[PDB]
Amino acid sequence: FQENRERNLRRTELSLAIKRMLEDLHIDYTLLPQDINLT
Amino acid sequence: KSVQVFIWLCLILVAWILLFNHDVKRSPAATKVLKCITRTLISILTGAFFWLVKTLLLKILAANFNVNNFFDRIQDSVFHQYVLQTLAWTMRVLMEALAAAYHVFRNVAQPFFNYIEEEDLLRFMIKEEVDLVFTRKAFTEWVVKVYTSRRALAHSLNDTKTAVKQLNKLVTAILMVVTVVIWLLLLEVATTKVLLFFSTQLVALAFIIVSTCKNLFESIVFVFVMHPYDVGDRCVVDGVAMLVEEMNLLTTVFLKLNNEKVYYPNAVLATKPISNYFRSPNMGETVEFSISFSTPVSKIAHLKERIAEYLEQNPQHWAPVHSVVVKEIENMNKLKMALYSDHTITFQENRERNLRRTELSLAIKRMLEDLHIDYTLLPQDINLT
Amino acid sequence: SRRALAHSLNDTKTAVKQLNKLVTAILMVVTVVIWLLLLEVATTKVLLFFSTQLVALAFIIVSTCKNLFESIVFVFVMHPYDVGDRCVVDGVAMLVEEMNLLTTVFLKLNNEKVYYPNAVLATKPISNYFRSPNMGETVEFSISFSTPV
């Protein structure tokens, strides 16, 4: 961890790679369904 | 002066003792008078030696601070003398040493001449000296900054001198009292029983002043030995920026961002971290922003390139070195990034730092606006009954 | 790395020189009082008064001498870090710049010069990045509970 800049750059690259990988796999997150009744 | 007085006193003492070494019983009463006189002479010799060691200690501490103190003072004095010409002995000179300055500088410079008048500098100093010393507005700002730095250095020197004077007064007081009791004991005016009672009373007094003497002495150690900050330097204590105004043996006047006068005991500071902005090198800065998780990597690359070009095209405020990082991903809805850059100055100039940070934030906002980057909340579905 | 090692060696030499100066001072004063006592220049009563004065001085410098000596112990015996090695104190990364008998210059991620007393560090954990082996990393992400295995 001495090379803070290099570690941060590598972590950013890993995060971007993970984001791309999730994008290709078609993985989505949805909130809890909510029901509404009118009066 | 101290050594001269010491040698004079020792020479007088030895001359008297050698002359009086004769064993003549002039009178039984005269023996007591001679004994008292020689006891007083040796007592004053001891007092002179104590004064000599006191001044030696004070001078060594003063010079330990004075290496840097007089370096800065000499630099400021040389700058001030050069400016005036264009328009120990060192300690005395340093002690002796705005709109008016700007007006004077403008008058010296040729009218309608933004650049520094080379002819004026040449007539006042050599070309090499003028170049080493070195826009009319920029020159005026530099002169004002130099004058402010010289004034701050003079104020710091005055505060250090006042603290040294207080310490000298305390040391002198203690040495007077110890030599007075030494003389009283050497004259055997009182008996032993009362002497022992007084010794016990002094022991009790010490046991009473335990806490105060300990706190004061550790305060001296913190002020001198540690020397974490000087006058006129902004420091962060307990995570809040604070500016040093005046330093004492037990009180340190501080000014916050809102000109809040705070008296911080020196003993407490000895157990807490202290950060100095003035001595620190060029400081960094962080800007926090978030953008949608679905943005293409091409937009991120374009943003990074534009940030690099903006930073490199303004070297006067930010250094070329920079870094764009991603902290963490939460709900994969927004990405957390921080922009790291190094300012051309320290954090002492709070107003300038804040203005530069505001300019950087506005620039980043504009850059995001041009790139067409938007953030949307998590989609929500609703079913009716 | 060579420049950092040279700077660390210079800092260690400066600390050793300060300790040598302190030790030399104390040994000069003790030998001076030894000589004065051996010459029996003064009487016993004043000698006892001076002994009591020295006892009072020690009782006054209790805290400072204790703190300084434990600082030496922490710097030398424990030896938790050297110059040029990044360390985490109280959960914040900090880079060592220079080490003294009572002051340790530190540089944070934003080049913040912080003077940390050595005595306080003796009662807090210290982490050294330079001496540690290859370090790990963690990345946090969340995905829908209904995704197939």
From Swiss-Prot, chain A:
Subcellular location: Cell membrane
Highest taxon of source: Eukaryota
Tissue/organ expression: Detected in the root tip and throughout the vasculature of the root and leaf.
Primary role: Mechanosensitive channel that opens in response to stretch forces in the membrane lipid bilayer.
Family statement: Belongs to the MscS (TC 1.A.23) family.
The protein, known as: Mechanosensitive ion channel protein 10
Record organism: Arabidopsis thaliana
Gene this chain is encoded by: MSL10
